[PDB]
From a paper:
Diversity generating-retroelements (DGRs) are unique and unparalleled generators of massive protein sequence diversity. Three fundamental components define DGRs: a reverse transcriptase (RT) that has a unique sequence motif, a variable region (VR) that forms part of the coding sequence of a DGR diversified protein, and a template region (TR) that is nearly identical to VR and is located proximally to VR.
The structure was determined and refined to 2.81 Å resolution limit, and the entire length of TaqVP, amino acids 1–381, was modeled. TaqVP appeared by gel filtration chromatography to be monomeric in solution and was observed to be monomeric in the crystal. For all structurally characterized DGR variable proteins, the nine variable amino acids in TaqVP are solvent exposed and form a potential binding site. We observed that TaqVP started to unfold at 70°C and was completely denatured by 90°C, as monitored by the loss of ellipticity.
Residue numbers in the entry: 1 to 381
The structure:
C-alpha cells in the first residue's frame, strides 16, 4: 500500500482548495488543516508603510516563501493544539498553556503570532478592496451582528442570537460552520473564524505597565524563544524613529488612558477615555499590578488617539498596533497600562462591532483563562 487514509485526506483538502490549503500531521499524527499565505512586501499594501517583506515572513533572519495559518480555531486534542473543522473551539486556557500546546505538535508548529495575524489582516484588507474590514463572523451568540441570517452551529445547541450567558451556556460555534463570508477571503478556502467565535491568544506582543513590547519580526515562531515575563528577548519601540530598543528606555511608545481623564481608585471599573498612544504613562494608584482588574482605556481602532508630538512609526501600523486608514469601522482596542498584559485578538460571540480583524484586547495577564478566549496553531517551513 502506497495509500494512507491520512494522506488521502490531505490530497482531498488540497484538491478542493485549489492547492491553497493542506493537512499536515503532528508528532502524534493528528490533523492540522492549514492555509498558505504567500509572502508579500509592505509596498503592496500601501507604499507609505515602508519597504521589504512583511515581518510575518522573516524568521531568524531568513525570508520565507510563505506561511501556514491554521484554517480554524485551535482545539486541544490529547496534548496538541490542532486545527480542524466542525469542533468546539479551544477555550479556558491561558497564554502559556496555548503557547505550549501549540508547540507540542512538533518542529514548525507554533502559537499563531501577532506578526502573522498582522500579515493576514493587512493582506485581507488590501486584497478585498482596501476599504473596510472585509470579514464577518460569530459576533452575536452564533450569528453575525451585521448579518442575522449568517450563523454557525452553536456548541451549546441553542439558537443563534440567544443570549444564554446567565444559564452558563456559551455562544461558541463549531469551527468553520459559518458561511464563507466568515473566512478571510470570502471563499471556502479561507481562514475561518478569525473574527468572532472566540478571542485568540497571539505571540510576539506584550504590555508592561503600558509600554508596548514585541518579539522582533516573526521570531515568535521558534519553539525556543523565551516569551515568559523575564525574557531578554522583548523589545520596545522608540516613537521618534521607531527603532527597537531596550525596555525602560526614554522615548518608548505606550498605551495610556486619556490625558483628559485620571485613575479612580474606587474599586470600580471605568473605561478611561479614548485610548492614547504617546511616550508616557499616567502613574496608577499604588499597588496596582498584573493581578489588578480595574480601570482601563479603549477606543475603536480607527479612533486611537495619537499623542500631540508623536508620529506613529510604520512598524506599529504593520503589526496592527496603530491604524493606517480609518476606513476600518470595527474592531476595538483595549489596554491596561499597569502590570503585564498578553494580547488576544479577533473578538468573540458576545462582542459586536468590537470584534473584527483589528480587535485587540490587552486587559488580561498571561494567567487569565476565559470561556471566550482560545488559540490557533500556525506553521512555517
Ligand atoms: Ca476569533
Ligand atoms: Ca476605578
Amino acid at each position: 500500500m502506497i495509500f494512507s487514509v491520512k494522506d488521502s485526506l490531505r490530497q482531498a483538502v488540497e484538491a478542493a482548495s485549489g492547492g491553497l490549503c493542506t493537512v499536515m500531521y503532528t508528532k502524534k499524527g493528528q490533523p492540522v488543516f492549514l492555509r498558505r499565505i504567500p509572502r508579500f512586501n509592505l509596498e503592496d499594501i500601501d507604499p507609505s508603510l515602508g519597504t521589504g517583506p512583511h515581518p510575518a515572513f522573516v524568521v531568524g533572519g531568513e525570508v520565507k516563501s510563505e506561511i501556514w495559518i491554521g484554517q480554524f480555531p485551535g482545539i486541544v486534542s490529547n496534548g496538541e493544539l490542532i486545527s480542524v473543522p466542525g469542533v468546539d473551539p479551544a477555550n479556558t486556557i491561558n497564554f502559556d498553556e496555548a503557547l505550549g500546546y501549540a508547540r507540542a505538535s512538533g518542529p514548525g508548529f507554533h502559537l499563531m503570532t501577532n506578526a502573522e495575524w498582522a500579515a493576514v489582516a493587512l493582506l485581507t484588507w488590501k486584497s478585498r478592496g482596501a476599504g473596510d474590514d472585509p470579514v464577518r463572523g460569530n459576533t452575536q451568540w452564533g450569528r453575525s451582528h451585521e448579518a442575522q441570517w449568517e450563523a454557525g452551529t452553536r456548541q451549546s445547541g441553542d439558537a443563534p442570537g440567544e443570549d444564554t450567558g446567565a444559564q452558563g451556556r456559551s455562544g461558541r460555534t463549531l469551527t468553520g460552520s459559518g458561511p464563507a463570508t466568515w473566512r478571510h477571503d470570502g471563499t471556502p478556502a479561507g481562514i475561518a473564524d478569525l473574527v468572532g467565535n472566540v478571542w485568540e491568544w497571539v505571540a510576539g506582543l506584550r504590555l508592561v505597565g503600558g509600554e508596548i513590547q514585541i518579539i522582533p519580526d516573526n521570531d515568535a515562531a521558534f519553539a525556543s524563544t523565551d516569551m515568559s515575563a523575564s525574557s531578554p528577548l522583548w523589545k520596545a519601540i522608540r516613537a521618534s524613529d521607531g527603532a527597537l530598543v531596550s525596555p525602560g528606555t526614554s522615548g518608548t511608545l505606550k498605551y495610556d488612558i486619556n490625558p483628559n481623564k485620571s485613575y479612580s481608585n474606587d474599586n470600580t471599573i471605568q473605561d478611561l477615555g479614548p485610548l492614547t498612544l504617546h511616550t508616557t504613562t499616567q502613574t496608577p494608584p499604588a499597588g496596582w499590578d498584573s493581578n489588578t482588574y480595574q480601570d482601563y482605556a479603549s477606543a475603536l481602532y480607527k479612533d486611537l488617539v495619537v499623542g500631540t508630538g508623536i508620529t506613529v512609526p510604520n512598524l506599529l501600523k504593520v503589526l496592527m498596533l496603530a491604524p493606517h486608514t480609518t476606513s476600518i469601522t470595527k474592531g476595538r482596542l483595549y489596554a491596561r497600562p499597569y502590570g503585564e498584559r498578553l494580547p488576544i485578538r479577533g473578538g468573540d460571540w458576545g462582542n459586536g462591532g468590537v470584534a473584527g480583524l483589528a480587535a485587540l484586547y490587552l486587559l488580561n495577564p498571561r494567567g487569565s483563562r476565559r470561556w471566550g478566549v482560545g488559540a490557533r496553531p500556525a506553521f512555517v517551513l
